[PDB]
Structure 1
Amino acid sequence: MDEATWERMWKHVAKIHPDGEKVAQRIRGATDLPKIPIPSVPTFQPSTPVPERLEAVQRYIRELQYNHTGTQFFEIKKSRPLTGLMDLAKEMTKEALPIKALEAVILGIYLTNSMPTLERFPISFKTYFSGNYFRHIVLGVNFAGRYGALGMSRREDLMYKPPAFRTLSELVLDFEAAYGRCWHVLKKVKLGQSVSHDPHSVEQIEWKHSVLDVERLGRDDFRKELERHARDMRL
């Protein structure tokens, strides 16, 4: 990154960290800092079952670390054609910097395009906690009729899910329960369509094909609308 963005990051650090400038004083120019290995982009034998591949993909995502610096290192324009987002995903693997939820979704797509028997679709959440709204996103996946997820979160139970849920409803209800355990109220769920496995596709990701108002729908219509989206995807 350029001089200007670099100084912007450290200026931001000074305002949000309590010790402020002393963090920058310790780190900037320090000579014996840990060398961070560049995480190895996972590659897969054809004998390896898809669920085991998903474990390796998620391990790679986790190795990059959640970005707590306050500065996003990759700009993600969500309307960009898939081929452009996949160029960005490659750049993410080469620069190997910390990431947040949306970056992990793009990486998850990039690293599973080699899995045509796996369907991938974004799942975004809108939640409410302590008078404020929060947004989060994961990459929902479907293998052999079971649902799981890839992603990046501050919390362990708001990202990776092995593909073992029998319905999309059960997957989303598991996220809702995890949010409840962190005292968030789940307000909306936005579900995208399946993403092409062609990394040179020029079509856009459809992020918000279904928008579910959890509170207005109620338990049974919530599940029914989730079942409808799953049907929409099997086309």
Structure 2
Amino acid sequence: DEATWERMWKHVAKIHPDGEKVAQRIRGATDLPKIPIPSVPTFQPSTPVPERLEAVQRYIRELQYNHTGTQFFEIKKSRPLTGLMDLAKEMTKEALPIKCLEAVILGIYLTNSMPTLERFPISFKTYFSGNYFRHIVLGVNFAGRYGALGMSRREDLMYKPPAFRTLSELVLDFEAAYGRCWHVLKKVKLGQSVSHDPHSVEQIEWKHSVLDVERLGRDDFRKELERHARDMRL
């Protein structure tokens, strides 16, 4: 894949202040810091699922957020689960920086071994300064409590330990986090539970419920998140 490769370097030349010298120095450097390949977390059966989730999120963090502007693992959201799981395995083998969508697939791959853990995508549409912004994380449920795995440029727009007692509190935490960086939350897309079968021929349902956060209002927004939580226990 040489075409893509030189595409990434030309795009860096534009956006960075000293675009050209940066590519020269890095591509031409004979000695670079060797990056250790992150070890895939494997768990004893005695380890509680919350402690497992911290290790999965730590592994996801080690890969780092992809700031290069070029995505290394393209994801067709309509692919069957067994196709995305093959792709997650290759992220595991390539071990490259990632963005929001790739971390959701990794979170599913690494939590398929936890049948007591429910996983479901949560994507957000936010508004700021005339522009729209889309982000997505992996919602998780353990022992009746809610949390999230994901990848973001902000610390409070990804990992939440499974401590929220309702889905509303989890989502409103994200809305509050969006508000702290002056983003208005326009729309929330919540998916259905993801099968734990890594060979499953079914798609992820990214849009089982679409909530218009402005046209709904506070309490009607809360009732909709509670209906979605009720729906995942189907």
Report the TM-score, using the length of structure 1 for normalisation.
0.99
Deviations 1:50-76 (A, max 9, x none): 000000000000000000001000110
Deviations 1:112-141 (A, max 9, x none): 000000000000000001110000000000
In structure 2, distance between residues paired with 1:147 and 1:161: 8
Deviation, structure 1 residue 18? 1.1
Deviation, structure 1 residue 29? 2.6
Deviations 1:203-224 (A, max 9, x none): 0000010100010000010000
* Aligned partner of residue 147 in structure 1, secondary structure: strand
Structure 2 gap segments, 5+ residues each: none
In structure 1, distance between residues paired with 2:19 and 2:73: 24
Q: Which residue number in structure 2 is paired with residue 114 of structure 1?
A: 113
**Bigger mean CA offset, 107-116 vs 25-34:** 25-34
In structure 2, distance between residues paired with 1:147 and 1:131: 32
Deviations 1:63-122 (A, max 9, x none): 000000010001100000000000000000100000000000000000000000000000
**Bigger mean CA offset, 29-38 vs 110-119:** 29-38
Deviation, structure 1 residue 5? 1.1
In structure 1, distance between residues paired with 2:115 and 2:76: 25
In structure 1, distance between residues paired with 2:100 and 2:4: 21
Query: What is the identity percentage for the equivalent residue pairs of Structure 1 and Structure 2?
Result: 100
Deviations 1:160-203 (A, max 9, x none): 00000000000000000000001000000000000000000000
In structure 1, distance between residues paired with 2:28 and 2:113: 41
Deviation, structure 1 residue 31? 1.4
**Bigger mean CA offset, 190-199 vs 5-14:** 5-14
**Bigger mean CA offset, 23-32 vs 124-133:** 23-32
Deviation, structure 1 residue 32? 1.4
Deviations 1:129-156 (A, max 9, x none): 1110000000000000000000000000
In structure 2, distance between residues paired with 1:217 and 1:41: 42
Number of residue pairs the alignment of both structures matches: 234
In structure 1, distance between residues paired with 2:196 and 2:2: 37
Find out whether 1:222 has 2:203 as its counterpart: no
* Aligned partner of residue 217 in structure 2, secondary structure: helix
Deviations 1:21-53 (A, max 9, x none): 110011003111100000000000100000000
* Aligned partner of residue 87 in structure 1, secondary structure: helix
In structure 1, distance between residues paired with 2:5 and 2:218: 48
Q: Which residue number in structure 2 is paired with residue 147 of structure 1?
A: 146
**RMSD, aligned CA:** 0.5
* Aligned partner of residue 228 in structure 1, secondary structure: helix
In structure 2, distance between residues paired with 1:132 and 1:102: 20
Q: Which residue number in structure 2 is paired with residue 165 of structure 1?
A: 164
Q: Which stretches of structure 1, 4 residues or more, deviate above 4 A after TM superposition?
A: none
